[PDB]
Structure formats: C-alpha cells, structure tokens
Amino acid sequence: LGSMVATVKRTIRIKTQQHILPEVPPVENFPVRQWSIEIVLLDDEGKEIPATIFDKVIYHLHPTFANPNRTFTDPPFRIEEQGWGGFPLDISVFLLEKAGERKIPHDLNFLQESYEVEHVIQIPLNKPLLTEELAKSGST
Amino acid sequence: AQTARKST
C-alpha cells in the first residue's frame, strides 16, 4: 500500500439526463437528444453536496464533437450537449492544490431519461486547503 | 433508440 496509505476515500456521484429534441432532424433516422452531465460529492451520510474538492473538471468527449475536451471550473461542473449516440467517456477531475488528476470512467447513454452513477476516488491528505475542504464531506 | 451507440 505504501504511499497509498496517506489518502482518504470519497464517493462522487455523476448525474446524467437526456431527452429527444424533435426540432432537430434525425441522423440516419436516429433522433438527436439534448443531454447533460453534472458531478456532486456525497458526504458520510450519502447526502449530495457541492464537489468543491475539484478546482476543474474536463469532459473528454467522443471526437465526433467539436473541441471535445470541455473544461468547467464551478460546481456542479454541468455540461450540456446534443448528440445521436451514446458513448463511453473519461471525465478528468482535478483535485484542489494540484493534488492530482483522477480519470473517472463514465458511460453516456440513452437507456434512461436520467441516471446516476457513483465512483469512489482516493484523495491525498498532504495539501492543507484540500484537507480542510475534505472535512466538509466526512472523516479525514 | 435508447440503445443508440457510437463506435470508439
């Protein structure tokens, strides 16, 4: 375990919603949908709170999107787009104080109108400002 | 579609 001993775990929740845009012509008879993704943090009780432990989130979209790497700096880091197909994507989340990048695997899909996915990430405890922020969401 | 997917 070594250096990994000096971390805490937190659960983040990725929230996705999508709906068809009828005013947009289907692509090969596939409807174009508006979709959104946001990110929240869970506390030790499972309540959603702002994910302020990240100072940046970058969505790395399918290369069929114009400038597919979309950067957000303010919680809940909400991205909105239009598209005709689902796809796996990586979400890069950057911890405060350059504590590290985490890549979170997401799948953007049209199986439900809205769906939530939880991911556990390990966060270091060596950056004072990040450690203070972490206290808001649970034990450290 | 609900199963519409793109190739990677």
Question: Is the distance from CB of A68 to CB of A62 less than 8 angstroms?
Answer: yes
The domain that holds A41 is classified in CATH as 2.60.40.1970
d(CA A15, CA A97): 25
Interchain contact, B5 vs A109, CB within 8 Å? yes
For residue A128, how far is the Cα from the chain centroid? 24
DSSP string, A57-74: EEEE--TTSSS-EEEE-S
Interchain contact, B6 vs A62, CB within 8 Å? yes
Q: How many CB atoms lie within 10 A of CB A49?
A: 15
What are the tokens at A120? 């556990």
Experimental approach = X-ray
Question: Is the distance from CB of A18 to CB of A49 less than 8 angstroms?
Answer: no
Which of A62, A84, A110 is the closest to B2 by Cβ?
A110
Instruction: Count how many domains chain A has.
Output: 1
What are the tokens at A123? 């966060």
- Give per-residue burial for A108-128: e unless 16+ CB within 10 Å, then b: bbbeeeeeeeebebebbeebe
Helix (H) or strand (E) holding A113: none
Domain range for A46: 1-140
> What is each CA distance from A62 to A17, A58, A67, A78, A85, in whole angstroms?
17, 13, 10, 17, 10
